[PDB]
Amino acid sequence: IEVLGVKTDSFTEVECFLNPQMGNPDEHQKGLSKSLAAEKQFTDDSPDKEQLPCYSVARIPLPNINEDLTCGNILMWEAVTVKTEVIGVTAMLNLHSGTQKTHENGAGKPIQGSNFHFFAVGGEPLELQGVLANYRTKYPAQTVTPKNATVDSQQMNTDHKAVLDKDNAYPVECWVPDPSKNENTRYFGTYTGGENVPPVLHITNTATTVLLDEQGVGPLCKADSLYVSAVDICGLFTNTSGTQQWKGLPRYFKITLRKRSVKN
Amino acid sequence: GIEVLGVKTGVDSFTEVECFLNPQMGNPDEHQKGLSKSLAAEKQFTDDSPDKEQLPCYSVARIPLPNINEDLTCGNILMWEAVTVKTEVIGVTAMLNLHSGTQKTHENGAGKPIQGSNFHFFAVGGEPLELQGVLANYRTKYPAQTVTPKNATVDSQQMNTDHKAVLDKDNAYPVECWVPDPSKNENTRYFGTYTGGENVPPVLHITNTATTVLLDEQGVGPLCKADSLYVSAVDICGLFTNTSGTQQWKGLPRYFKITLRKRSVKN
Amino acid sequence: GIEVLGVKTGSFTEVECFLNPQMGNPDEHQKGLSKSLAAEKQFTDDSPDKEQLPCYSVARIPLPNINEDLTCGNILMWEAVTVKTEVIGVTAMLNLHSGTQKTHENGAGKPIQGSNFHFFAVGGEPLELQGVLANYRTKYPAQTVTPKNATVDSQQMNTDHKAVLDKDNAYPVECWVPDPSKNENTRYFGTYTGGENVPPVLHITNTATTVLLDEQGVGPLCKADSLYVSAVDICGLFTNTSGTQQWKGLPRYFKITLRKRSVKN
Amino acid sequence: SFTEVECFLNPQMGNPDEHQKGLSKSLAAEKQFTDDSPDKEQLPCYSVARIPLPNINEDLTCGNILMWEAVTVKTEVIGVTAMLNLHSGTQKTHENGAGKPIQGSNFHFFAVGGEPLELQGVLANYRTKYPAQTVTPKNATVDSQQMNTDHKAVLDKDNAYPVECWVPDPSKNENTRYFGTYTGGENVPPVLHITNTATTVLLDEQGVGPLCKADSLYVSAVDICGLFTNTSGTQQWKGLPRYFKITLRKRSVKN
Amino acid sequence: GIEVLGVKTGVDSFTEVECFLNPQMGNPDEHQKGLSKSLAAEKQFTDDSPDKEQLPCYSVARIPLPNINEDLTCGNILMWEAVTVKTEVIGVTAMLNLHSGTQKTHENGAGKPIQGSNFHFFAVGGEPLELQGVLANYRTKYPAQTVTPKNATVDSQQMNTDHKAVLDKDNAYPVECWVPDPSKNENTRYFGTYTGGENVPPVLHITNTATTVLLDEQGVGPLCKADSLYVSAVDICGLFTNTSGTQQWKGLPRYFKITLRKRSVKN
Ligand SMILES: CC(=O)N[C@H]1[C@H](O[C@@H]2[C@H](O[C@]3(C(=O)O)C[C@H](O)[C@@H](NC(C)=O)[C@H]([C@H](O)[C@H](O)CO)O3)[C@@H](O)[C@H](O[C@H]3[C@H](O)[C@@H](O)[C@H](O)O[C@@H]3CO)O[C@@H]2CO)O[C@H](CO)[C@H](O)[C@@H]1O[C@@H]1O[C@H](CO)[C@H](O)[C@H](O)[C@H]1O
Ligand SMILES: CC(=O)N[C@H]1[C@H](O[C@@H]2[C@H](O[C@]3(C(=O)O)C[C@H](O)[C@@H](NC(C)=O)[C@H]([C@H](O)[C@H](O)CO)O3)[C@@H](O)[C@H](O[C@H]3[C@H](O)[C@@H](O)[C@H](O)O[C@@H]3CO)O[C@@H]2CO)O[C@H](CO)[C@H](O)[C@@H]1O[C@@H]1O[C@H](CO)[C@H](O)[C@H](O)[C@H]1O
Numbered sequence A: 001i002e003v004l005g006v007k008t009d010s011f012t013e014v015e016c017f018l019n020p021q022m023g024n025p026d027e028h029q030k031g032l033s034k035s036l037a038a039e040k041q042f043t044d045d046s047p048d049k050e051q052l053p054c055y056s057v058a059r060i061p062l063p064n065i066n067e068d069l070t071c072g073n074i075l076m077w078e079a080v081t082v083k084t085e086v087i088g089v090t091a092m093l094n095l096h097s098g099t100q101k102t103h104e105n106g107a108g109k110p111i112q113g114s115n116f117h118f119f120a121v122g123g124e125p126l127e128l129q130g131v132l133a134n135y136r137t138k139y140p141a142q143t144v145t146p147k148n149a150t151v152d153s154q155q156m157n158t159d160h161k162a163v164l165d166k167d168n169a170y171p172v173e174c175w176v177p178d179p180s181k182n183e184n185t186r187y188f189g190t191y192t193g194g195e196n197v198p199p200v201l202h203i204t205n206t207a208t209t210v211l212l213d214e215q216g217v218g219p220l221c222k223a224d225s226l227y228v229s230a231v232d233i234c235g236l237f238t239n240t241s242g243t244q245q246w247k248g249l250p251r252y253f254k255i256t257l258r259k260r261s262v263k264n
Numbered sequence B, E: 001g002i003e004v005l006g007v008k009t010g011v012d013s014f015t016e017v018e019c020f021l022n023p024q025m026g027n028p029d030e031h032q033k034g035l036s037k038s039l040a041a042e043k044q045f046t047d048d049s050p051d052k053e054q055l056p057c058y059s060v061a062r063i064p065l066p067n068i069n070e071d072l073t074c075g076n077i078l079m080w081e082a083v084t085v086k087t088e089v090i091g092v093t094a095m096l097n098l099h100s101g102t103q104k105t106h107e108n109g110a111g112k113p114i115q116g117s118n119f120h121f122f123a124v125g126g127e128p129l130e131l132q133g134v135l136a137n138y139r140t141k142y143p144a145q146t147v148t149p150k151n152a153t154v155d156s157q158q159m160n161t162d163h164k165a166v167l168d169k170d171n172a173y174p175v176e177c178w179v180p181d182p183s184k185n186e187n188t189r190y191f192g193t194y195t196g197g198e199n200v201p202p203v204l205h206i207t208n209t210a211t212t213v214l215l216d217e218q219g220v221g222p223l224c225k226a227d228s229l230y231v232s233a234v235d236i237c238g239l240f241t242n243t244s245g246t247q248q249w250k251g252l253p254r255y256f257k258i259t260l261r262k263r264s265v266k267n
Numbered sequence C: 001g002i003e004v005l006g007v008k009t010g011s012f013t014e015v016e017c018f019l020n021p022q023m024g025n026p027d028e029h030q031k032g033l034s035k036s037l038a039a040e041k042q043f044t045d046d047s048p049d050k051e052q053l054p055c056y057s058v059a060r061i062p063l064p065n066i067n068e069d070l071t072c073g074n075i076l077m078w079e080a081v082t083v084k085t086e087v088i089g090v091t092a093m094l095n096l097h098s099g100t101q102k103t104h105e106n107g108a109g110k111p112i113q114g115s116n117f118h119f120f121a122v123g124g125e126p127l128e129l130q131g132v133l134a135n136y137r138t139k140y141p142a143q144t145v146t147p148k149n150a151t152v153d154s155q156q157m158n159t160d161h162k163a164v165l166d167k168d169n170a171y172p173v174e175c176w177v178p179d180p181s182k183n184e185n186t187r188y189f190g191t192y193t194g195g196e197n198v199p200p201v202l203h204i205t206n207t208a209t210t211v212l213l214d215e216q217g218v219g220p221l222c223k224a225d226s227l228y229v230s231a232v233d234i235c236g237l238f239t240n241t242s243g244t245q246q247w248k249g250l251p252r253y254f255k256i257t258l259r260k261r262s263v264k265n
Numbered sequence D: 001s002f003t004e005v006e007c008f009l010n011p012q013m014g015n016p017d018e019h020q021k022g023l024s025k026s027l028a029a030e031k032q033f034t035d036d037s038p039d040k041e042q043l044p045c046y047s048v049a050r051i052p053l054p055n056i057n058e059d060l061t062c063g064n065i066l067m068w069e070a071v072t073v074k075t076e077v078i079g080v081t082a083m084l085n086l087h088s089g090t091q092k093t094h095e096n097g098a099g100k101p102i103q104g105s106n107f108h109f110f111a112v113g114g115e116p117l118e119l120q121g122v123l124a125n126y127r128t129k130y131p132a133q134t135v136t137p138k139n140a141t142v143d144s145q146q147m148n149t150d151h152k153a154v155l156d157k158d159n160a161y162p163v164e165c166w167v168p169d170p171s172k173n174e175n176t177r178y179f180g181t182y183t184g185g186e187n188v189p190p191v192l193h194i195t196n197t198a199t200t201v202l203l204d205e206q207g208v209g210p211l212c213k214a215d216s217l218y219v220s221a222v223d224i225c226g227l228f229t230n231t232s233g234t235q236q237w238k239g240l241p242r243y244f245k246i247t248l249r250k251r252s253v254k255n
């Protein structure tokens, strides 16, 4: 999209709370995955959907701004800044409910281990690339995973292109944002691996991310729609029995937008 | 929110207020201030009734400010605007005591230092801090003398938008039940870091040279309603381990020094 | 050697590249992994297989020719100005169920972790290497380019060990490092972390850009209309149910912006 | 209008005997709250030195005088490489292995001011029976484990104020600049940087550095690097000297 | 000392020198260059006599610079001035060999990587680096062929100002005995980081885009006396662990790339 210079009614602000999609084994275990399996053979590994955390995504409708989309010059909503926040970090200070003792007489074991904290803001669905730890993994019916996985899907298999158009459908272990695309999206993620990794989570209402690219253009919202994507795997929760399930927390988005002139 | 006009400072347009806020970890008895009650583990999800003393709570103090004697009948008045804050965790060196009631790390070895999960948080606002409730266990039966999410549901372990509250009472709101609400708090600036893990080393910096500017994106700091300021804090440093192996949350006081200026607002 | 002149304005180009990792690939089914790793082999008889040895990844990217005559005193060359680069598939390691080893009874699988090395380079010619060995008496396998005539000093400085990254899946990571005494026409960046329990920390974003201009404002100049991207992304060790370990690698993406620069000829 | 003073400050870990300088006495554990009487040598203390400065005034009744003003400081922990000694009196990590390096809880701290550092007392155990030859919070109460504003003091004596009892007072210290970092945990790896290129500016928000009262400059330090583990498994704090290099300028003040 | 005058600019005013500095970890025999001798532990303070091969030493090289003065009988002269340095630890990827003489971490597992206490240090000066002696154990009986603090006393474990030296000899000054002296070194820039702990992960970055400026607060870089430049280094990466459990310090070479300019000075 060919963009024009900036104007100076011109602004709008939208909010969103996004629930995590860790699996939710039953009604009582929202924010969690099903117990995790281990030591499954590469040739016979069939994870349950509830064992697989998925990307969270919400399409946010923006106020109509064009009467006629055939006009040579139209206005689009341009995402300029975002404040974003992981919600409920203190909840993990509960070391008494269904926890596993660290030692005799001791407090319960805190949530810890591998984590992935990720967010994206774009004027389209996040564009994804497929990469698998095990290409022979038999993925459940209620998930969208890389079609026709091959030996190359554990490295680069360019055929595995997708978009994040469904909430609670695209497994995190299957997809990453595609850096060869996503011109109209800004995304940020950090993966930390290791069963003993301490979660480090910062909260504030003073941190802003500018969404303008190198030419000073933020994501341009197609069809007056804004897309917010998220993953916030905080780590593993350890049951008294020693079983473990992924723990996720909601993510808040506060996007500021401006009206931008574009060629049409 | 509140419509402000431009900045215009002269002589005696500034003021400075100080505050020491004690931690509210639980205080099992008079001899254990700054500590919680020993912590339980492995409680059934459907029958978990924590004691109030086991639950660290948010600290909050309302600081009165000098009366600017403004009559709220006119459309133009002056309000105190918080512009900067110096804040400090108090008594970090106290944890260098590894001999009092500690558990040795090994035979002939020194006592085990306070460590594990921690949460360090502070807020400055012209109103009480606005809170959102999130629970690890929505079926948790919280004690009478705590303010916790009302009518907790299945969704309270993720997003339940009904759980809105304000930090208006000290030693009442359990840290594990509440976080600052990012969808509100227009008139508050808050800052927090959570670290999880039983072996997490505390890292605490002290200095009198660090200043936090409280002005937002439009250059406006918290506007102090009713000539009052709110400071909030949590400083869970980690766990203290008793000789027996029992563990209790450790907290330290937090110091605030806020600088304010008179600002014109619409009324 | 090369004396630069003016830059063409108005003159730009962008090139992309996905580089597969070269960890060893023991068989068709195990790409991105090395072969089972050996330990405790004697110094005088250590003969590692090629599949046990991760290698440097490299791709030569062809660019358009800009000159009709190479006898002219002034000639145009492609100048790499910026690079966006990204490790691909970081989330794949959240698979803790496939062929993993339990951390405990009833527990999840052990995540990939341990020694890692993440490295990338952009240059107008192959990356220049210096050989250094942990064990100079190592018997390196066929189909690998390793330091020739390794001596006592190859465990420290042996300046005879000079090479160029001109072949993919051939130069073992453990034998070569980029040569800081050379590489005038290359920009390289690497981080080594050692320790069997080291957590991998991997960031992803499409908003991070590295400027490739040197102190004088000149980026890599692409000789023979060729751009070289080089990478190593050893993420750590994958632990099998049995406890056997193998290096894990991931692909790396490059997006390089180039401009036409006039140069003395 | 300028001057430069420099100082080396020995650590005050306790020094049980003349052969163990830089170390504390063996540390005790698992002592009762109501009967914990630590020896002075078991308690590391703040280091402090008053640095006399050239005299610049001849009449103190004047309404306008000159005071030395501290502008910058270069500071350095001294002897960090000494801990690469893993053979002397160390405990083996494993059969045939090297000795265990100093590690564990640490506290690195320095201050520059024109007065003694002002302290606030906070105690882990308010019922601790502190030994003679130490200055500790007087009349320690139930609230001394949190906020007890009666516990005010100044760092005016070297090897007297136990680190575990006192912190710099943020409600005061207008004429001092202090910086400290505490790390807790028995396995904490010491991380120590050295250079002669790092400078700290001591000017405050108004552009004024510490003003040296009575032509005196105070330098305060604590550098508990971690725990030294003896062969027997017995442990003692380890400290290192800190170097100060302060630049001062003449400033006019009301009087 | 040296009254510094104008900087020579433009044509024939700059030079560039490079250097690879081998590490001096001890070198037990010809097959173990880059390593120390197996390390001893639990030696009693009174009977501690370390071999030289067990003691990593500072690395140093004097780099001769082109003659700049045709006549040394002048009122003022030209000196080489070090302006910038690029420096690199060489061979970091060598430690990704976990199969040669290593100790497995577990059954069927890979070899234990090099890890533990590390010290990474470099210096650029127009003189030898000036050292202060500090000892962990002052009663340590240091071996022949090492320069260690003379007449070590009770105070050598803290501040003993008598222990002054200069790094004028390669593989002679034990790293555990000496640190750069911050009370001198006016004509040298030094940088080092010590990390202690037997499980500490080495973290080593490489690049040809990082430059350190050597100019001081006055805009003056090290002035090279007797047309000589001094590069100093220590790069203790950690401990190598043999199958048997014995451990030896590992070191790697360091590269230096220094840019110099001609400076006028009074003579
Ligand atoms: C070890 C134990 O059974 N603790 C239970 C505790 O019992 C009290 C005394 O224990 C300590 C401790 O936990 O080690 C002793 C410490 O010095 C105290 N620390 C401090 C800083 O004061 C702690 C601390 O006060 C509490 O834990 C705070 O909640 O208490 C114990 O010595 C004592 O036992 C004997 C006593 O020695 C003897 O003179 C007398 O004749 O009989 C006593 C038995 O009653 O009794 C103390 C009680 O007054 O009490 C708390 C409740 O107050 C808990 O029951 C605690 O057990 C843990 O409880 C946790 C949940 O709260 C969790 O379930 C753990 O698994 C339990 O071990
Ligand atoms: C220990 C075990 O066998 N777990 C299997 C689980 O069993 C369920 C209950 O176990 C817990 C647990 O894992 O500890 C109990 C916890 O309170 C729950 N935590 C939360 C936050 O809700 C978890 C959690 O709900 C699930 O793990 C999430 O998937 O489950 C167990 O107490 C219960 O016992 C029943 C018993 O089965 C029944 O015969 C008797 O009449 O009543 C008992 C009640 O006390 O059974 C629960 C299931 O009905 O079930 C899951 C499948 O839903 C798994 O089988 C799990 O075993 C692990 O499975 C992993 C892969 O999914 C992996 O293979 C591990 O190796 C297995 O241990």
Ligand SMILES: CC(=O)N[C@H]1[C@H](O[C@@H]2[C@H](O[C@]3(C(=O)O)C[C@H](O)[C@@H](NC(C)=O)[C@H]([C@H](O)[C@H](O)CO)O3)[C@@H](O)[C@H](O[C@H]3[C@H](O)[C@@H](O)[C@H](O)O[C@@H]3CO)O[C@@H]2CO)O[C@H](CO)[C@H](O)[C@@H]1O[C@@H]1O[C@H](CO)[C@H](O)[C@H](O)[C@H]1O
Residues within 6 Å of the ligand: D095, D096, D097, E028, E031, E032, E036, E037, E038, E039, E040, E041, E101, E242, E243, E244, E245, E246, E248
């Ligand atoms: C295990 C042991 O006793 N080591 C002592 C060592 O013995 C030498 C050989 O051991 C190794 C080792 O430590 O594992 C073998 C490794 O492959 C070598 N590593 C490298 C990279 O070359 C190391 C290394 O060379 C040295 O450790 C460096 O000092 O040495 C050992 O195999 C050999 O023993 C047999 C030999 O197998 C056999 O063919 C022959 O017939 O008899 C030999 C017995 O002499 O001997 C090697 C030396 O000749 O030697 C050193 C001194 O040279 C130490 O004694 C070392 O023991 C440690 O000493 C430490 C202090 O230096 C400390 O006290 C530790 O507690 C001791 O274990």
